[PDB]
Symmetry: D3
Subunit: 244 residues, 6 copies
């Protein structure tokens, strides 16, 4: 469909090359351009970023840091990325971009407030959500679908980086994995498909939020999706299809 | 002297190798061991870490982010590093380690409260300060000297990497530069020596907080310092000396 | 198993008769006694209550109140019940009972803080959690399992009122519904069983939290469960069984 | 007089029938209509509701909860009622309706701020105050008169149920009790009349806030009052009169 | 009678001479000594100070500052005095003295929390309450009685300067005015006696708090009162007496 | 030169005569007029006041209050003065004047937020900063320069009372001391000139903020300075001059 309000979910990994780590101005420029391409059509955007380029559980395990404790750390990463992204975004747009946090940091970002968030979006601002949900045991996926629904979003675009959609089985291997053009919710859980949190998926299904999994790394594809093109995978309550 | 209370100032750069970036478990293990070695003498320790291994102004300039905005981003880094550090320290100690923030994040760290901080230290806890000062235009040095004094610290140990103390002119060229055994405040400013912030220097001087600049990368040296040994450089209101 | 730490989840409905509504001192006395029966064995308890006896979606629909808005209201109900329950509990015990909120109300209840919560429990206090998760789109079930895991609980006891366990199909009808002695996670989702949130169930499964669904209305049964007796249904990763 | 700004004080009991308890959509519809009827004249309205339809001291006594503790519980009720009310009002109006709390709950309601409250009212919003005063030992009356004055209100309309105004001696026996058309402050206290708190009364008197006690259950009467009509009782520093 | 717990109400004017203004260390020393005399008997003390030696409505009027605004300024005065007083008290006692505010300033004083205040008192600390009630339109009298009741105080000692009690009619004038040994509440309001806020009087009368009005400026007298002596005036529900 | 944006640093002592203490409405009127004279040219003004007319370390020492504690008291002084000043300013201007605190007091003043402050200033408001920096060990000078830079101020006007500028050596004594027309930063520190904090000086020197030291007590002079005139002393990175 032609969406008017959208929620883009970005992995923290997308902001960094893979090499050393952190940020990579070539990657931040790509991200910014892809984002501005949508807003330029007057679509209202909310962005939820992960903190993967800063902090990983790989280290929490190493020092046996309590899971709730490792999540708090990783959450701060998301706020660092949100703040960065805003810098990059402001440089290229003249639109207002607001960073809202689930852990009010104030004088760093605005404490997150729903109706305020809706308000901004309505006023045509770009809003960025940091610190996800504020809760533990959860991935970037869940909070992001939760905010999408809270913000009366039309769709959630879940940006991937090199994987062009959702496949039957991991193509990084199997001669023949096929990619879904369409994918049912219940069908994803049934065939235990491993694309996004189950909890996120369920919520999205419960509220009828559609999701698009696609290649963020490929220029233009997020615009084509918003423009109505069928690129990548669409997760719906429609009945499953499959590229040909 | 034999100190009873100390504030160690660690750069974020110390928590990472240089290569890629972030954290380096070999480095975090060294840091923990060096800190434990001091507490093991029942010396009360406070730690102030920088956020350099996460965020650098090298970027802010790239995207022209406001100096005050870059500082807030870099500040969250200090809190990420504080939370890590704590994790590592807990793994190896039985002592209580408390992270206090100047930007109360709560349910992530304790909001900083002076007399609570003092109190902990008095109860033999290891306390870590994140978010520095909360203020802008300032480096890690300044807040660290400010918290040192606030905590009735006996000295501030400013841990350096690779560099053994304070020289006449940086050994990074001046072949025959010499290292000070002792360094007067007023003299450091006079001969415009660039070791730590002028502002931090001034404060320490005004409140008579002594400073030790030494090689943290060298096992033992922080203990020898606390044990009364003369290694690295001592910044005092005594009168300048010089290794031989 | 003989649990040492437990999380009891109580529906707000349990505090009221059904008639008019609110509280019912006969019901609050029952609740208190059932709770004290467990702690009297030195088991450490956390309680999560629903706000059903105060607020229902039946009215939100009636006035088309936004779902996120109706949830906030219902959340305040949970804090009213937590505070009440504490009153009733204090009257009958000499143990310390703490109410902790996910929306720090202060000077009404203590802002919820994990390690503090763990601490209390360790010190043998009875802790009550109000305001659930602080998030929308969620039922009392989910936050309660989340806090159970956060609090390193051994099991979650999900108290029912007239339904003695989990059945094949609703017995309020079908001549032959059988009750499970044991119930697999995956098995509950597979056969789309409608006992507790899927999201709560998944989390519990992911973290290995066991759950017991039973008759709170029947005196003694929560003690028998903690004492190791097989009464009601046990939701495990064991393989499904069935009463005979 | 023809008022430009008013503060209506509603008991929680008005939001419920008496029967069971809670809310009664027929009652919430009446309340909304009566409030709209006044704003429809471009009079600026603030509302203070009680929490009686949720919590009563009848219980606190039963379980001997501290008076200060019972008051906090009852206070949360006022905020639940404020949130409901707002929902109902939004459904029927296009005007902006704001809920401000004396216990900043945020992302549930706006923390109360005086000049913001005034400002709203000035911008023609309908504002609702929940959590009364935040203080104990006090009834709904007092804070409502305090917020009335704080808001530069022209009058306070104290909506009663079933009772048409203030009588000589409650018509609940005294057959020939008579209703005051006008009632002096000092006289209400002198002849110890029990209509509203002495403290609220005193304050109103000190700041010259006029009060109207009337039958809210009677359609129209709140408008007739604002329109200058003499219905119900007017509490003034004029000199006492009496219906005929 | 002998009281175990007591609230001392001190006006800001007592901390200063009258001359210029602010603080007078001779006066501060008197205040400290009188306070310690009472605690030295292991009576538990709470203190409420006014902000009069710093700010008075005399200006507010001059520049027409909103009464609510003037009070907010006046309130900051009480906190300043609390903090001073604490300094003074600390210098002379070994006891712990805690300053608690009604406007949580944190890292300046502790946010006021009831059960914490009670606890402190129970642990033999000296507690000082600053920022009164947080509310406008009210004097020091009211909040101080409110805090007395909240703290389960046995009596409220209202220290006056110059006047040894409550007289029939002010004695500058009334050459044969007489001082009450005992004063009924209802009588004070009846004969409209202007000694302390009506609102504060009514509260104390409703909860049975006894009040003592006496000459703070006279060494010993506050101890005499606590020792059971009959000096100054005692406001009770007993029946009015009169010195002879 | 002509400045568009300016920070005025006022000592607390200027609001009072010297005699007794507190506020002097003749002095407050002078201050208001001098401030308005500048804004009347549509120059944007921020103001930083000291708390000296209320509290001084003269006591702190007397009763040995911890330096950090004394400062916290001193800081409450600045907020009181801010609030007063605002009252005064409001009475004479139609312009909006906002008080922002570094210790969010809310419903007393607005919590300080940078971009909000900048915005206000941009919208032509007058902004007052209270509670300085929030930090200890520092004077009014430092925070005021820090806020100047944060606010993108063009200059910092440091109003002095009695002394028309910066002299070679203090003129009570130095009968032939001379006043600088211009003063280099590095020179002020070199010749250890004691006019304003070194720390404040260094900051301003690092960010290029120009400072003006002049006689506030002399009508007109602050306008003359802003009008491009050369009155008082100008601290720059130009090269030192000297009146003739
Ligand atoms: N930490 C923060 N907490 C709260 N608000 C913040 C914070 N940081 C920035 N702000 C915001 O406060 C400012 C204005 O508040 P507000 O949203 O009411 O603006 P507005 O008047 O509605 O819109 P506009 O900017 O177009 O004038 C903006 O600069 C915005 O960035
Ligand atoms: N955000 C926070 N705010 C306040 N307290 C916190 C926060 N995070 C952790 N805490 C702390 O609260 C708890 C209790 O505080 P405190 O240090 O005074 O304990 P205690 O009762 O004196 O005894 P103990 O030394 O055994 O902890 C600690 O266990 C610690 O985790
Ligand atoms: N709103 C609140 N916010 C924070 N703490 C609160 C609040 N309400 C009550 N408290 C608590 O503060 C008090 C003591 O704090 P703390 O947990 O450090 O106690 P403790 O010294 O560790 O234990 P104990 O009560 O056994 O002496 C208790 O009365 C407890 O109820
Ligand atoms: N907890 C809260 N804290 C602060 N603001 C809140 C909170 N909840 C809601 N708000 C509000 O923040 C928003 C913006 O504030 P404000 O009323 O000043 O809007 P505005 O920019 O001046 O214009 P408008 O009248 O269109 O809303 C509102 O839409 C309102 O929902
Ligand atoms: N703004 C604040 N918020 C919370 N607590 C505060 C604040 N300011 C001060 N405190 C307090 O926290 C500190 C520790 O609290 P607490 O009195 O419960 O300590 P304790 O470990 O139980 O033992 P004790 O105080 O007797 O030495 C106190 O010294 C006091 O300074
Ligand atoms: N403690 C506080 N926290 C937040 N905002 C506050 C606080 N105290 C005061 N305010 C402010 O909130 C009010 C509304 O904010 P704002 O200035 O952005 O209004 P506005 O609707 O955009 O228009 P305008 O102020 O020009 O009339 C101000 O009048 C000011 O009083």
């Amino acid at each position: 469909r032609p969406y008017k309000r959208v929620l883009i979910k970005l992995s923290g990994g997308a902001l960094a090359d893979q090499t050393g780590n952190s940020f990579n101005s070539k990657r931040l420029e790509h991200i910014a351009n892809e984002i501005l391409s949508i807003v330029d059509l007057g679509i209202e955007v909310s962005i939820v970023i992960g903190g993967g380029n800063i902090f990983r559980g790989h280290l929490a395990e190493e020092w046996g840091i309590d899971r709730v404790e490792a999540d708090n750390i990783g959450t701060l990463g998301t706020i660092i990325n949100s703040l960065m992204l805003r810098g990059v975004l402001t440089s290229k747009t003249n639109k207002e971009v607001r960073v809202m946090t689930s852990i009010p940091f104030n004088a760093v970002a605005e404490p997150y407030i729903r109706l305020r968030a809706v308000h901004h979006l309505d006023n045509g601002y770009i809003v960025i959500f940091g610190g996800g949900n504020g809760q533990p045991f959860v991935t970037t996926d869940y909070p992001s679908v939760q905010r999408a629904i809270e913000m009366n979003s039309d769709a959630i675009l879940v940006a991937k980086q090199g994987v062009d959609g959702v496949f039957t089985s991991d193509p990084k291997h199997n001669k023949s994995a096929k990619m879904y053009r369409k994918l049912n919710y219940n069908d994803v859980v049934r065939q235990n498909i491993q694309v996004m949190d189950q909890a996120a998926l369920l919520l999205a299904r419960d509220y009828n939020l559609p999701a698009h999994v696609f290649n963020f790394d490929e220029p233009g594809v997020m615009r084509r999706i918003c423009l109505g093109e069928h690129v990548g995978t669409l997760i719906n309550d429609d009945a499953s299809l499959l590229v040909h």
